[PDB]
């Protein structure tokens, strides 16, 4: 019509044979490419690598735990009760733990063993209604609760002079009582004091989880040494066990590694909790330059992190006077500590440090956000590499995605890298370029790609760098 | 022969509500949420999104049985300002907006139908453009063969979509039922709504992302029966079950997950999927990929009539617009459509060309209302089946031009390497219109290529 033929015309020049052939051969040709790149989409699919299976994680997996020994000085001085401890839930939630280990709430005498009641409350912290009522305020803000249990936690000896047997039968029915009072896990410290404490674990194990496989149980010693910690893990082996296996040392990081090593290596790899103890803060080991460089290393490691109370903004016994280094208190705000009105500061509150994003405060609550969150931190594979003289340096990964790289200098002088890792399997080798999270020390750029063999470190700095699963 | 009439008003319904319910509802909820801050924030953004697209599309419904010829908001402004500009819009849609939405969608349904094998992973990115390519090429030959075949496929698709969505709007609804209501208690609801329209705005434009396609039977006039009741019947019957189905099927989505789980997840569907059902938790992204087909189908049933229209009017080249016989379908603007389609497999990401663009949508959108006033008053010679009231076009106007601003205003080089494009298109349309009398080496060329097309594909012009 317009810039081409009309029917007829048409008609009748294409009928003529040839064309037809030219029609049908390119149908055949179009329904034959196809099925071609139908094929080339099956081939490329069975040829590609499956994924793992998530290895079905629990709720103590997650992130952190929060240890609140003393209750009377976490809030203050009169609402040192149950009731007022559903007020700070959201600070909790603002620090992303997943689990609240109580302090011992039973009533509890002396050494006196007759007036030592596991299933009664003492009244100086409330009754069983404020308990419940806790509870389930907790349950409504993802936040598990973990009784400890200790029986003479008032005493010198914290498992009762006397015999363990009438002892360690009380704490039997003391766990199916608090079960399903609705709990969900409990904690014995001090447990070297117990005698055969080896087959009494395995009992309360064995009680804990013929109730739920939602439930823990966690055990506390002094020992830091390796083969004592192996010998109370060899029939249990889904026992947490706090120790003070971390704590002892700290001047050289060639000797971190070591540890943390030829834990993993004596193990076999499996789920393990990282303390520097059972019962203190960071800062009764730690000087207080080195409180950034834990922090990221506790929060990297493969198990579950426990801290105290205070540890997320380095709270210091030998800083207030006319104290109990046991349990100092907390400073919330500026007030908070009546005696000495005078002796705080701003950079020492919570208040103060909520503010400032070069803070102690303010990097827990990163390092707690990337814990929880990541799955390579969740449930990745280890692999430390050999770097230069003073550095802890390894790398994080799961399966395919993104993967993490720690490095950290525990020395004084600062030095160059020498990321000379060479060991790693094909699938978590470095490349040229990483981008950078974090550092404890401000004074850099968080994003920009940085590359690593020019990668020099200051006194004391930790570094969070990622890749991505490519070649 | 001319194309025909059969397309009747519950395949005018199915047309609109397949081709908007397409891979919005699965893949931006996470946009609107991440930038409106809140829960509550974000379900008023799609309410509003929804009365947005349903005031629009009666100014269309007047719109079309006023100036009833196939082609909307092409012909429209054809009607009214003429050859040129008509040609830009014309030009902007055929090489951008209708080759980019469709090879979207086609990508989605390969990477959700593909979902199931590699369920904590990336799928391969190359298989997934294979199956979406496999997905336009087929829908392209169904589409050349009948347009009967079409519409069925237009039916069983939307209905499937529905059913589809009907089971995720009930399972939320269970969820509430069993009495453990976590978020929507009406006291949080709220917190995190943050203020700042700068970037509330880039939120609505994620849910207006959900509702494109609302003006896709316009196109398709001129095949309709009776397109006086129909096509006003199967715009009001359509619109507000979409926009009712987009609210409660992001209440579902928020009866289950909690917010941070919803910005930092890549997939909301498969989350629903997995805590529901956890055993035969594979059939929801199944069903995505089944959404993803049917509204990939709709789009090209309607571009293609489009670049029909286009060719009739001496805008672009003549072997479009024409009929094959027998068959009586539009085999060379099909063709055409799908070649444009799988061009677009060469992008690393085409869902950045998306804000790009926007702003040129909603003028062209905006000037077909505004000519639409001015037909009012300087053309009363004409005879409108429905009259709207007034004043909500000019709402709608209003609306139009607040948001063309807002985007020029946080992201101005985005919409300047636009204005570039829409430019580009110049020099081709005088070139090919305004140059008649053209040198005599050149036509004798174009004549025998469009009548070897014509021997190729058995194709006849339009006239009886
Ligand atoms: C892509 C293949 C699909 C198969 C169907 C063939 C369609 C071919 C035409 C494609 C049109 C591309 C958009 C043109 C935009 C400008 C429009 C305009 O200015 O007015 C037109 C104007 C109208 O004049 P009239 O046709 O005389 O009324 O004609 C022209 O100016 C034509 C000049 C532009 C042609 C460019 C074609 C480039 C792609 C060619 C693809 C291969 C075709 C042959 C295939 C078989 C080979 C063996
Ligand atoms: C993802 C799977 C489950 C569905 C994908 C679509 C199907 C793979 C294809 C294969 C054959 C196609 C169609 C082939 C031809 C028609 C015949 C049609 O009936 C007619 O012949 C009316 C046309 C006429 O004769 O005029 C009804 C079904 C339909 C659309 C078929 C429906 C299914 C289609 C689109
Ligand atoms: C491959 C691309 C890039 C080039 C374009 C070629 C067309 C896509 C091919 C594919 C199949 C060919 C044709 C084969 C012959 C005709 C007549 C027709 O014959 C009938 O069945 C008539 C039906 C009836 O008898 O009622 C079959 C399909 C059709 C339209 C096809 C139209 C499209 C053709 C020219
Ligand atoms: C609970 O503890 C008892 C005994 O402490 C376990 O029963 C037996 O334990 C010994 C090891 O001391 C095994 O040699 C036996 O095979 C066990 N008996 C069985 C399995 O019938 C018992 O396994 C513990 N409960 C659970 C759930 O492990
Ligand atoms: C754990 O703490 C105790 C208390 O200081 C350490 O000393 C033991 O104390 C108990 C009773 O107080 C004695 O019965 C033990 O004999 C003491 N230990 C030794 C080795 O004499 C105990 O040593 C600490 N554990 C470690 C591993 O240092
Ligand atoms: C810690 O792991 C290493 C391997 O990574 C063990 O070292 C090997 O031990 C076997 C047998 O003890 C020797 O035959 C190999 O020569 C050792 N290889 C290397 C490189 O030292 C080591 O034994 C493990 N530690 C313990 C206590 O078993
Ligand atoms: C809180 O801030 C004050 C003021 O910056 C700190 O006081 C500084 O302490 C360092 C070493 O502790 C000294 O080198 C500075 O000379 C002190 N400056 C002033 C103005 O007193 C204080 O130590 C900070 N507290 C903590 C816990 O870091
Ligand atoms: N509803 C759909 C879904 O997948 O859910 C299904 C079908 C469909 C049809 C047409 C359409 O128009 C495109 C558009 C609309 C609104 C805002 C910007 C664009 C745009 C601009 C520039 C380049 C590409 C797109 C969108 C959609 C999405």
Known sequence: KFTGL??????????????????????????????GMLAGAVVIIVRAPRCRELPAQKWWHTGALYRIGDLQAFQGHGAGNLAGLKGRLDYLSSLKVKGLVLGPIHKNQKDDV?????????????????????????????????????????????????????????????????????????????????????????????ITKGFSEDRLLIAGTNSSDLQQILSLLESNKDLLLTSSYLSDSGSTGEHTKSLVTQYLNATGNRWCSWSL???????????????????????????????????????????????????????????????????????????????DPGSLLSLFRRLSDQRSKERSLLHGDFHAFSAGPGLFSYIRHWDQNERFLVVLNFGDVGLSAGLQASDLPASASLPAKADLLLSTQPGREEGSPLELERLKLEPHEGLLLRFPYAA | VTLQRNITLLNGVAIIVGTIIGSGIFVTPTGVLKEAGSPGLALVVWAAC???????????????????????????????????????????????????????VAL?????????????????????????????????????????????????????????????????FVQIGKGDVSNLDPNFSFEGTKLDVGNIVLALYSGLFAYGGWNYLNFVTEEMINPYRNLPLAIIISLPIVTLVYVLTNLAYFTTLSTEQMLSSE???????????????????????????????GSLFTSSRLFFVGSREGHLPSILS???????????????????????????????????????????????????????????????????????????????????????????????????????????????????????????????????????????????
């Open chain 2, 50 to 104: 929804g009365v947005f697209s349903i005031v629009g599309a009666l100014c269309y419904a007047e719109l079309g049985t006023t100036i009833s010829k196939s082609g909307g908001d092409y012909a429209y402004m054809l009607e009214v300002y003429g050859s040129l500009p008509a040609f830009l819009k014309l030009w902007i849609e055929l090489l951008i907006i209708r080759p980019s939405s469709q090879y979207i």
């Open chain 2, 322 to 464: 024409m009929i094959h016989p027998q068959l009586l379908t539009p085999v060379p603007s099909l063709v055409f459509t799908c070649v444009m389609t799988l061009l677009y497999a060469f992008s690393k990401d085409i869902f950045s060309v998306i804000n790009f663009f926007s702003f040129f949508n909603w003028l062209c959108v905006a000037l077909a209302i505004i000519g639409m006033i001015w037909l009012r008053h300087r053309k009363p010679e004409l005879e409108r089946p429905i009259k709207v009231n007034l004043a909500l076009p000019v709402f709608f106007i209003l609306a139009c031009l607040f948001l063309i601003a807002v985007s020029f205003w946080k992201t101005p080089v985005e919409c300047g390497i636009g204005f570039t494009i829409i430019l580009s298109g110049l020099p081709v349309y005088f070139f090919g219109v305004w140059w008649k009398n053209k040198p005599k080496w050149l036509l004798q060329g174009i004549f025998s290529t469009t009548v070897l097309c014509q021997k190729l594909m058995q194709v006849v012009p339009q006239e009886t």
């Open chain 1, 6 to 35: 009309s029917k007829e015309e048409l008609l009748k020049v294409a009928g003529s044979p040839g064309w037809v052939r030219t029609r049908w051969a390119l149908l055949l040709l179009f329904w034959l490419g196809w099925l």
């Open chain 1, 277 to 355: 103890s059972q019962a203190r803060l960071l800062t009764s080991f730690l000087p207080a330059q080195l409180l950034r460089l834990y922090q990221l290393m506790l929060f990297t490691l493969p198990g579950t992190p426990v801290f105290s109370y205070g540890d997320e903004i380095g709270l210091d016994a030998a800083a207030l006077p006319g104290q109990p280094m046991e349990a100092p208190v907390m400073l919330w705000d500026e007030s908070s500590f009546p005696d000495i009105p005078g002796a705080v500061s701003a950079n020492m509150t919570v208040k103060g440090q909520s503010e």
């Open chain 2, 108 to 172: 989605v349904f390969a990477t959700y139908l593909l979902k199931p094998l590699f369920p904590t992973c990336p799928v391969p990115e190359e298989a997934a453009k294979l199956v979406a390519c496999l997905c336009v090429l087929l829908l392209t030959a169904v589409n050349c063969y009948s347009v009967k075949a079409a519409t069925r496929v237009q039916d069983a698709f939307a209905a499937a979509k529905l059913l589809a969505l009907a089971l995720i709007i009930l399972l939320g």
């Open chain 1, 114 to 206: 007759a007036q030592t009641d596991l299933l009664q409350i003492d009244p100086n912290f409330g009754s069983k209604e404020d308990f419940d009522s806790l509870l389930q305020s907790a349950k409504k803000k993802s936040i598990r609760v973990i009784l400890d249990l200790t029986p003479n936690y008032r005493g010198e000896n914290s498992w009762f002079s006397t015999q363990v047997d009438t002892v360690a039968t009380k704490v039997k029915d003391a766990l199916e009582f608090w079960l399903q009072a609705g709990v969900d896990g409990f904690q014995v410290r001090d447990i070297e004091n117990l005698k055969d404490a080896s087959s009494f674990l395995a009992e309360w194990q064995n």
């Open chain 2, 267 to 297: 997939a909301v569907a498969v989350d629903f999927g997995n805590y529901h059902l956890g055993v035969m938790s594979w059939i929801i992204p199944v069903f995505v990929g089944l959404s993803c087909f049917g509204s990939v189908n």
